[PDB]
Design a protein around this ligand. Sequence first.
Ligand SMILES: [Mg+2]
Ligand SMILES: [Mg+2]
Ligand SMILES: [Mg+2]
Ligand SMILES: [Mg+2]
Ligand SMILES: [Mg+2]
Ligand SMILES: [Mg+2]
Ligand SMILES: [Mg+2]
Ligand SMILES: [Mg+2]
Ligand SMILES: [Mg+2]
Ligand SMILES: [Mg+2]
Ligand SMILES: [Mg+2]
Ligand SMILES: [Mg+2]
Ligand SMILES: [Mg+2]
Ligand SMILES: [Mg+2]
Ligand SMILES: [Mg+2]
Ligand SMILES: [Mg+2]
Ligand SMILES: [Mg+2]
Ligand SMILES: [Mg+2]
Ligand SMILES: [Mg+2]
Ligand SMILES: [Mg+2]
Lengths: 71, 82, 62, 205, 85, 80
Amino acid sequence: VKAARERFGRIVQMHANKREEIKEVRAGDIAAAIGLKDVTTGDTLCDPDAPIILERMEFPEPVISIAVEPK
Amino acid sequence: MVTIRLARHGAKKRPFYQVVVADSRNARNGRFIERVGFFNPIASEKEEGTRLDLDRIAHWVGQGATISDRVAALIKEVNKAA
Amino acid sequence: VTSYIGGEGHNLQEHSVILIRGGRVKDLPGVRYHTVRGALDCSGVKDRKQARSKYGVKRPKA
Amino acid sequence: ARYLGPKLKLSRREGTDLFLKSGVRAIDTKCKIEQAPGQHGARKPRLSDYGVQLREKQKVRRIYGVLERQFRNYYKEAARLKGNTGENLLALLEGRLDNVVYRMGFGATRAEARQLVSHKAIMVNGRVVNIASYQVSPNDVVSIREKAKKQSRVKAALELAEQREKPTWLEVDAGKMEGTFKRKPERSDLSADINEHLIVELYSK
Amino acid sequence: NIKSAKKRAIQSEKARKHNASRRSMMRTFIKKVYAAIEAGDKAAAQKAFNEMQPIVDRQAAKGLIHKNKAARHKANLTAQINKLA
Amino acid sequence: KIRTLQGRVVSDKMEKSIVVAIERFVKHPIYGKFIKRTTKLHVHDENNECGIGDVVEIRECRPLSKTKSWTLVRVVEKAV
RNA sequence: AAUUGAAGAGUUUGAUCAUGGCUCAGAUUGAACGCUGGCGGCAGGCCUAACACAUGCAAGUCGAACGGUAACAGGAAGAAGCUUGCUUCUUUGCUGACGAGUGGCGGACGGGUGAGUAAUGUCUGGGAAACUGCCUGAUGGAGGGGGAUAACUACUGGAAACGGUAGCUAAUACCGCAUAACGUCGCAAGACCAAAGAGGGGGACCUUCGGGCCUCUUGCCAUCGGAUGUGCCCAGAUGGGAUUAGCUAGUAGGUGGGGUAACGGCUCACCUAGGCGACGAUCCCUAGCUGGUCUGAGAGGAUGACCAGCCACACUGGAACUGAGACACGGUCCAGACUCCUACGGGAGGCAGCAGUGGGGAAUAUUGCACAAUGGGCGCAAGCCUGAUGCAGCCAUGCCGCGUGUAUGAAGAAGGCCUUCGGGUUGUAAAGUACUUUCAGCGGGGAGGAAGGGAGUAAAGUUAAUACCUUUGCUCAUUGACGUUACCCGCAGAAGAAGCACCGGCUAACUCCGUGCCAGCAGCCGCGGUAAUACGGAGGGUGCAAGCGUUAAUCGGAAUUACUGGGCGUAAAGCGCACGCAGGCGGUUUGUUAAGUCAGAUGUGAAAUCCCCGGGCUCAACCUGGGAACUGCAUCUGAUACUGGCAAG
Ligand SMILES: [Mg+2]
Ligand SMILES: [Mg+2]
Ligand SMILES: [Mg+2]
Ligand SMILES: [Mg+2]
Ligand SMILES: [Mg+2]
Ligand SMILES: [Mg+2]
Ligand SMILES: [Mg+2]
Ligand SMILES: [Mg+2]
Ligand SMILES: [Mg+2]
Ligand SMILES: [Mg+2]
Ligand SMILES: [Mg+2]
Ligand SMILES: [Mg+2]
Ligand SMILES: [Mg+2]
Ligand SMILES: [Mg+2]
Ligand SMILES: [Mg+2]
Ligand SMILES: [Mg+2]
Ligand SMILES: [Mg+2]
Ligand SMILES: [Mg+2]
Ligand SMILES: [Mg+2]
Ligand SMILES: [Mg+2]
């Protein structure tokens, strides 16, 4: 959903109380990818040979505004 | 102590050594006292491949230089005894 | 410093973060730099087709 | 790294046939030589001294099918090498394997020659040589591989090749499909109205 | 610091304390000689020089003072013990 | 033979320490004019031999003080 | 054969010539950005914050120095569940081996960075007063005793870091005693100085049966050499500033003491009153130096990434200790700034080693594989360690290769664009039709980097020995991280692979439309106010091509700081006028000198780089043998016209 590729590096699973490290992550699991450059929330990470966009949840849309100045 | 040894000077995957006299402490491709031959493990069965100024090695060996097990096999093969 | 914004139209307002280029505008004494379209918070020139590399416009979908 | 585009276009620009379509018939026409290299092609833009100087090298480049950088590097070498920087640029050009194989008639066009060299269809002295730009020496022997010997292309190629001005600095076969690079051609034994001092005058400033 | 060859630290300490104490007394002996010169006692000077010579030499050997230092002491002490005494 | 050095004495009063000046021509690295180059050296002379104005011949030697690594060999001419 | 190569253009004017600045064509880059992007080879990759750092790794190794047993394994000063020669339990350090400890060697190498340093350094050429681990040559020594202490054991404090008392023990740890020259002091006479043992095997003779004993291999001490390393000294060169002119108390010299490995105001007491500076001291600013790199015809200008030499630094300031070597990058001590741990009493740490995070920024990479190779530490060796190194990953950052097809194809299709409505163009381009299959994909097969070590065995090699040890043949198993390597052989099908800037002059490339001093372009001149080749779109063309542009930057053109190689009547430029110290310059003859100057010879000018000619990777890039070159420096010997010094005119 950005038309750029990313290269996975270190991987971490938050593991009850320790950022345990991983070299492989299978389907049906969750984990956090360290170092990925430009991946915002909602993006799909798919196989480059088998590209697909996924559903992407929805973005709640703010209800309040306020102006701010830098003191 | 001073030593005769090989300083890798080839290029990736195609090394080309430069046998040399040096203070053992210096870097392999570093500071050296004098060049005293070479060894090209590629070369190809062409005209050239290995060269040792055996007279100079012999001389340095005279003042207590030492020799790599690999320079050894390279001398003990370019011969000098029959 | 004061800086030029080339091409037809722009977004660019009081808080825009831009990338400044260098290169004068000899109609605007004092303006000695360009703001590089398509870099950071400056958009490329809408609907342009020629010389797109300047003016930060991407190739339109072959 | 290759031009690929429409080739007569290249020819009509220079105002002369460069044998880019040598293949068979025509040997020009069925293109409308000169009379429209573009929409305004049928004009005589009286072009400057920079103009002719460019166009003349832009011809040589197009004759042998060599792009700028390689060409420049050839220029550098010709300079350096002892000799008249003008002619030994052409020397280098003619010494090209992909050229040599064409001069020997294994392909109709210098392009077709290239495709043969690249598809590993050609050997020098026994050893197969893949790269189009291989500078061939004298006594070397380019030969077509038996693995694809006298099939469709090369038959016809030798055939119209034989019916082409037959070179001198090389001895070709046809039965064994082998040629010997006798020696580097002299400036004399190749030419047309192709200058050099222009191609040199150009790269000096 | 996490490099276990920090035993070198505990080691060379034993060294400092050893060196210190030996290096201490060979100095206090050299002193005894200079004192005699200042006291003027030709006898005690040559006497005290005889007592200090083995110390200076032994320590130089053991590698605590080094050779030429050993020389320099008995060298110019001598020079002086028989310059007025 | 002994790498020595000629040059005239400037200043005298120092008690076995005579300062010798050593003129020398040399061509300017950029512009070519040959120009003078004085070179001052603190020289040891045992038993205050020389004196102001003298021309002296000296040789380099083992250090003798803070800036003092030359002794004389000869004197040559003297009076003023 | 080998530093044999010098280009101009636009722009002041109505026009001109000159002057003069701005501007442009080139080459280059550790680049960045915009649009675009197929592969490979070689190389490069935090230029900013010497900013702060989570995590792991980057320095160990020897049981052949010692006491030793925590774990492994074996054997057992020998034992069950019976699964009687095949197991899993207890002992015994017996042997292999090995946590902790003593001890030895290494931790001063390797690697990182440029903060400081304008001369405490670097460069070039010399010099004398010096030490130097391991390696090496020679000569002898290697005798005989003593006191300890870690570990350990027993109490015992901490959350942790760390320990605390008492007692015990080994050695190549430690200290006497002997021995004492070709060593040190001394004119001599004379005084005085050291050390260590350990392994493999073994005929007898033998003993407390531990081994004495014999042998081979190592190690220990001393002295003198060699080698390498290091310290010290001198001259010359190595940035800018006078809107910095004076500077200097250990200051300059001396004498004598002390001190160092060594010379020395290095230090101290006294005496002299010196020392430095207009040839730029002093004080400011900036800065690692070099080989080289970039540019240039050259002289020059610019520059010091990557490779190699030298120096300096290691959180900041400071100090020493150990040691052959440090005032120590992953050591000690003090202090400071800062961060972290704590059970609140107390503790700990310093990536400018590799990878990596944050931060800063226009911008610079993986928390990878392996010791197979080269090399380094320890070891007799096997081996262990090695983020040095060898490879891979990332990025078009650069260089060099290759591909994205090759031929064929016309009344020249459609469509677009211009059209004087005839046509012209895009364009053999497309389609169509034959052909090839590199490189990507798939399946096969398979070099080289691997030399060595290890077992056996045969050799007047030893030796009391047919042991041990050593060497060399031969023989037998075996040693790649890269690695699905290079490369070759098969398979299918044009199949998976083209962008980017420009087209008014400089400048290669021209039209329609829109727009109407608007919107905008623009390196320089300059375009735009209704027929814009200059703006924006299109068609067409031109140049480049996996890159292309823009920006930034150095040199060039720029003879525009002019040594080479310029000017000052009016263009910028002669001080309003003189006097005159320093400086520069100096008529004419001879003699003398030989500093300048010229000649020769001999040293050195690291290797790499540039160049020449060869050789090796399919070519090229790249790698590589030899040569030339390093135009310099120093020294010795000559020359004596010219210049200078001196003499006399
Ligand atoms: Mg290319
Ligand atoms: Mg142990
Ligand atoms: Mg004794
Ligand atoms: Mg004194
Ligand atoms: Mg003294
Ligand atoms: Mg600095
Ligand atoms: Mg110049
Ligand atoms: Mg510090
Ligand atoms: Mg010490
Ligand atoms: Mg550190
Ligand atoms: Mg940022
Ligand atoms: Mg034009
Ligand atoms: Mg119009
Ligand atoms: Mg336009
Ligand atoms: Mg110039
Ligand atoms: Mg002028
Ligand atoms: Mg004027
Ligand atoms: Mg006047
Ligand atoms: Mg050199
Ligand atoms: Mg004269």
